Ligand binder design. Structure first.
Ligand SMILES: Cc1cc2c(cc1C)N(C[C@H](O)[C@H](O)[C@H](O)COP(=O)(O)O)c1[nH]c(=O)[nH]c(=O)c1N2
Ligand SMILES: Cc1cc2c(cc1C)N(C[C@H](O)[C@H](O)[C@H](O)COP(=O)(O)O)c1[nH]c(=O)[nH]c(=O)c1N2
Ligand SMILES: CCCCN1C=C(C(N)=O)CCC1
Ligand SMILES: CCCCN1C=C(C(N)=O)CCC1
Ligand SMILES: [Ca+2]
Lengths: 359, 359
């Protein structure tokens, strides 16, 4: 089975091609993770996935999506991740982390608590920052503060500091969050970036924040550990042909800047879109990025069917398959997949105290 | 649906009728549980089961099955369970524990490490104790030493000490392990008990160790928390009619002695048997014990299909359905069952960070 072949990137070897993508838990307090996360991540890692990327973790407090988001903006925050890292490794999985800044989509309620921008009366809220003073709209009407050159320099340095802290916590895989309409994606998109300085206007200028951040992080992140990023390569906003061409060119520049793998996603930069949600709908998009930018890729958004995952690998659309919600439903989904694809000794996808009894 | 009705017994209310029965993990060292257990139990509790009975926990070192079995024979051992109790409660489940003594089946290898008696030259082994100096046979050939009267007093007191510790660690449900061929079962069975003192021969005498242990535990275990036991009510040894009749009379005496619920199982006292394994095969046996002894019951051994569980409850065969291996496969099996049975807002069997997304 393609899905259960190992994968080696730099010095890291994954035991199979199942990745658990970052999934916000909204259970942290002041950025600090706790027993919610400890058990959540340890249980999924024991489930058999080869790679577990920890949820979007804010590089600065204002970079959280919500008051429940994890952070890594101080050494105390980083120390809190050490037992999560070590529990993932003890299970035989590889620990990764996604470091993030929510940009204009920050200062929002938890999804099951309204999922909308926090109101001004509410004392949980904070001022948001973005390339331009323009609101997402819809359920996120708050207008961000337009970043100055000093802000841009400060945020870049926050990504660098976060990467250094991830390294020292023991993460073996890092993912820069340049997707889903948050700070990085919003610098790239003409929808949200109306700057007239070096960071807006042209393709080179709009790309600049992303490329400068990647290069700054590259200076502290170990050369022998995968350096990856997540990027929304189209919006389904009526501009897909040109947007995707630009996105793929940026992926070529990521590669020339030392990126080891790209997690291919959707932009979500504005609400006025028509995303054609469906089983494995990103497969052919990821394939095009992979082939044209000549870079390893993963993608998500409809692969929790073991046959869909296997198919995407056999078609060389993906190098890793990211399976999210199915792991929330069943933290041992990788075992389920091994059974469903007829892997020999499928139960030994799991640790002995389970595997012995399930074969 | 019947599966998702609450259950109240003494001061304890279970949020549904799904119980996770005790399942040995063989991952402890010198009886001390560790991070294996912490995550294992916390993840299953978050999966939605109403009751989680912690694995067979030895009241004394020689009463472990294996060198990996959990123990509660010191206050340090009991303190190790406190975070497990706390995590089970935090998940909305009720924490229980099974306290145990393996009798002549003790001093064995872990199941994936041969599953047989440790040989005499292996320094990991120990002398075993039992009512009479008779081996189980087959893969457990070691002959136990016959217990003295002082041994019997000491082991009863170890059960008392274990219950006291379990109480103080915060467990809300206790289960005495009088099943599966271990020490208690072996006092009751004529196959293993050939004693000629007060603890063997007659039905009263064979019952004595079990009834005295129950009464001694009852003195320390709070009256407002369920006091339960697991007991093998037949062997499938060609003596089932008489064995079942005696087992049911013993169950009546347990009830008279303050037992709140009986977990109905198979004796496994000797290897020379013909157990008719199949889906829910214990259902009719449990029903008969329930009806004739007038005690609430649970059972296991083939109920991990949601329809089989639901059917057993509607037929009033069981008050709680114990689902073991399906929870090793999927710690969130209770959510899977809620979906399979068409429970409304089934995803909210799980905590919010999962339920919101799975709706
Ligand atoms: C609870 C939850 C939380 C998040 C997500 C989604 C969900 C369900 N996703 C998107 C996620 O990584 C993935 O791409 C999607 O879930 C699609 O994959 P599945 O169809 O769920 O396998 C996500 N994406 C990301 O880049 N960083 C993150 O922290 C989050 N957080
Ligand atoms: C790994 C493992 C370990 C144990 C068990 C079984 C398994 C699979 N079982 C028996 C268990 O509680 C249950 O009765 C059986 O698993 C049958 O139920 P299922 O068919 O698995 O739902 C068990 N029984 C018991 O009384 N105390 C225990 O500690 C153990 N340990
Ligand atoms: C962005 C649209 C839906 C996917 N989600 C992504 C998140 C992320 N942190 O990238 C958080 C919630 C949902
Ligand atoms: C006689 C074996 C029945 C199932 N098991 C029960 C155990 C028990 N501790 O009661 C341990 C292993 C297996
Ligand atoms: Ca011996």
């Amino acid at each position: 089975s393609a899905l259960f072949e190992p994968y080696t990137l730099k010095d890291v070897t994954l035991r199979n091609r199942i990745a658990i993508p970052p999934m916000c838990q909204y259970m942290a307090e002041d950025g600090l993770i706790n027993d919610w996360h400890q058990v959540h991540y340890a249980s999924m890692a024991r489930g058999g996935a080869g790679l577990l990327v920890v949820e979007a973790t804010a590089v600065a407090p204002e970079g959280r999506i919500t008051p429940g988001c994890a952070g890594i903006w101080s050494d105390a925050h980083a120390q809190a991740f050490v037992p999560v890292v070590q529990a993932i490794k003890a299970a035989g999985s590889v620990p990764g982390i996604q470091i993030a800044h929510a940009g204009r989509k920050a200062s929002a309620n938890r999804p099951w608590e309204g999922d909308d921008h926090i109101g001004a009366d509410d004392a949980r809220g904070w001022e948001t920052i973005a390339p331009s003073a323009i609101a997402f709209g819809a359920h996120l009407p708050n207008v961000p503060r337009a970043m100055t050159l000093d802000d841009i320099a400060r945020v870049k340095q926050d990504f660098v500091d976060a990467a250094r802290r991830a390294r020292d916590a023991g993460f073996e895989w890092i993912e820069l969050h340049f997707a889903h309409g948050y700070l990085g994606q919003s610098f790239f998109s003409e929808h949200s970036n109306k700057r007239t300085d070096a960071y807006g206007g042209s393709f080179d200028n709009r790309s600049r924040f992303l490329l400068e951040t990647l290069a700054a992080v590259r200076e502290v992140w170990p050369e022998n550990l995968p350096l990856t990023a997540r990027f929304g390569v189209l919006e389904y906003d009526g501009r897909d042909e040109q947007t995707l061409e630009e996105s793929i060119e940026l992926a070529r520049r990521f590669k020339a800047g030392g990126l080891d793998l790209l997690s291919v996603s959707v932009g979500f930069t504005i609400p006025e879109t028509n995303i054609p949600w469906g089983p494995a709908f990103m497969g052919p998009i990821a394939e095009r990025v992979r082939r044209e930018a000549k870079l390893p890729v993963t993608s998500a958004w409809g692969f929790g069917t073991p046959q869909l995952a296997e198919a995407a690998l056999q078609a060389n659309q993906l190098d890793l398959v990211s399976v999210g919600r199915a792991h929330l439903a069943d933290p041992h989904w990788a075992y389920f997949a091994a059974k469903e694809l007829g892997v020999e000794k499928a139960s030994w996808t799991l640790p002995a105290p389970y595997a012995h009894w399930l074969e």
